[PDB]
Amino acid sequence: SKYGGECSKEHNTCTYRKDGKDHIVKCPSADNKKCKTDRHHCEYDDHHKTVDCQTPV
Numbered sequence: 001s002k003y004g005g006e007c008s009k010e011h012n013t014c015t016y017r018k019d020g021k022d023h024i025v026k027c028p029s030a031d032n033k034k035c036k037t038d039r040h041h042c043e044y045d046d047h048h049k050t051v052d053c054q055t056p057v
């Protein structure tokens with residue numbers, strides 16, 4: 001399952017909604033997954049056990 005939120009460019013974190021609560025996780029440091037655009041959509045995928053702060057559109 002995918003849980004969405006928004007990323008912080010300054011802190012390279014993703015704040016996502018799951019189980020009624022907001023959770024802050026670091027984004028990856030990888031070039032094409034880190035938070036490059038402030039408040040970009042991000043998601044935690046609990047199937048793949050991944051975070052991506054450059055989700056596609």
Ligand SMILES: [Cl-]
Nearest residue numbers: 028029030031
């Ligand atoms: Cl690194």
Ligand SMILES: [Cl-]
Nearest residue numbers: 030031032033
């Ligand atoms: Cl990457």
Ligand SMILES: [Cl-]
Nearest residue numbers: 028049050051
């Ligand atoms: Cl990850």
Ligand code: NA
Nearest residue numbers: 012028029034
């Ligand atoms: Na980084």
